[PDB]
RNA sequence: AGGAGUUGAAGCUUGGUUCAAAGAACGUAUCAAG
């Protein structure tokens, strides 16, 4: 459960507000996609365990073992720290597990809508008490004063030189500029848009950088269309980007 | 030898016909988009 997605989509006041809007609306979905897929990868598991991924929500179905509990708490700590590095209080995921017996989801004694209700109660409980003590202490201690800010992300750190737009705040605009229908999305240790756990996204087109797919170890592919099912391994991400002309003057 | 008595009376006082028609209905410049 990502909270406050709307105020991050509309955290724009600059010139390029058409591009940044579609950039952020794509970016939240793709963050939720890679976060879920990396959890399944660290759970040595296939993508069949996803019931549904939507706008800000991702419901899952895993096993009930204590090893999964340990890796779930570690995933909690890593993901929470990575958001607290990048989006200070702006974005927050609320992972809560609920346990059910195998008889309990057979629906013979009922008890399924209250499984959703209990998961909502635990999600709201973790939403009520978000950060721990040392997270708030570090988050107040890392404050500093500067004479510059970015104009969308009104934010006084991680700003580039000679120009006054924050690094995600400019990366979204650039990657929104080069984004078409048949374009491919790729993630690796070198990219443009920041994702946990330290692997970025390039979102490069069919161009001179297609040659990474040869020996693409530790590299994943997010697709709009699927044609090749040999050694391509492109999984579909559902995003709708119809564009007639992209210039409003020619359009009118 | 001329005297009187009528000095105008009645009727219609406008009738019908189209009673605002076609045009423009904001254009631009910053803002934005590229």
TrEMBL record:
GO terms for molecular function: ATP binding; endonuclease activity; exonuclease activity; transferase activity. ATP 1 binds at residues 3-6, 25, 29, 127. Mg(2+) 1 binds at residues 1-2. ATP 2 binds at residues 52, 57. Disulfide bonds join 150-153, 150-166, 150-169, 153-166, 153-169, 166-169. GO terms for biological process: defense response to virus. Keywords: Antiviral defense, ATP-binding, Endonuclease, Exonuclease, Hydrolase, Metal-binding, Nuclease, Nucleotide-binding, Plasmid, Transferase. Belongs to the CRISPR-associated Cas10/Csm1 family. This is CRISPR system single-strand-specific deoxyribonuclease Cas10/Csm1 (subtype III-A). It comes from Lactococcus lactis subsp. lactis (Streptococcus lactis).
């Amino acid at each position: 459960d990502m909270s406050g997605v709307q105020n991050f989509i509309y955290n724009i006041s600059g010139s390029k507000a058409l591009k940044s809007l579609r950039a952020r609306s794509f970016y939240l979905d793709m963050l939720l996609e890679y976060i879920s897929d990396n959890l399944l990868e660290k759970l040595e598991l296939s993508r069949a365990n996803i019931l549904y991924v939507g706008g800000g929500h991702a419901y899952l179905l895993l096993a009930n073992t204590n090893k999964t509990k340990a890796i779930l708490s570690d995933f909690e700590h890593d993901l929470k720290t990575w958001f607290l590095d990048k989006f200070k209080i702006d974005l927050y995921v609320a992972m809560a597990y609920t346990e059910v017996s195998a008889n309990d989801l057979m629906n013979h004694n009922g008890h399924y809508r209250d499984i959703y209700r209990r998961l909502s109660q635990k999600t709201s409980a973790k939403k009520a008490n978000r950060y721990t003590a040392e997270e708030i202490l570090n988050l107040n201690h890392q404050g500093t004063e500067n004479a510059r800010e970015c104009r969308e992300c009104k934010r006084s750190d991680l700003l580039i030189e000679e120009d006054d737009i924050c690094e995600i705040c400019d990366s979204l605009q650039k990657v929104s500029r080069d984004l078409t229908r048949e374009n491919i999305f790729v993630i690796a240790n070198e990219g443009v848009l920041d994702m946990p756990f330290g692997k970025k996204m390039s979102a490069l087109s069919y161009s001179q950088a297609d040659k990474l797919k040869k020996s693409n170890a530790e590299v994943q592919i997010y697709a709009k269309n699927i044609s090749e099912i040999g050694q391509n391994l492109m999984t579909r991400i559902d995003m709708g980007d119809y564009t007639y002309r992209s210039d409003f003057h020619e359009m009118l």
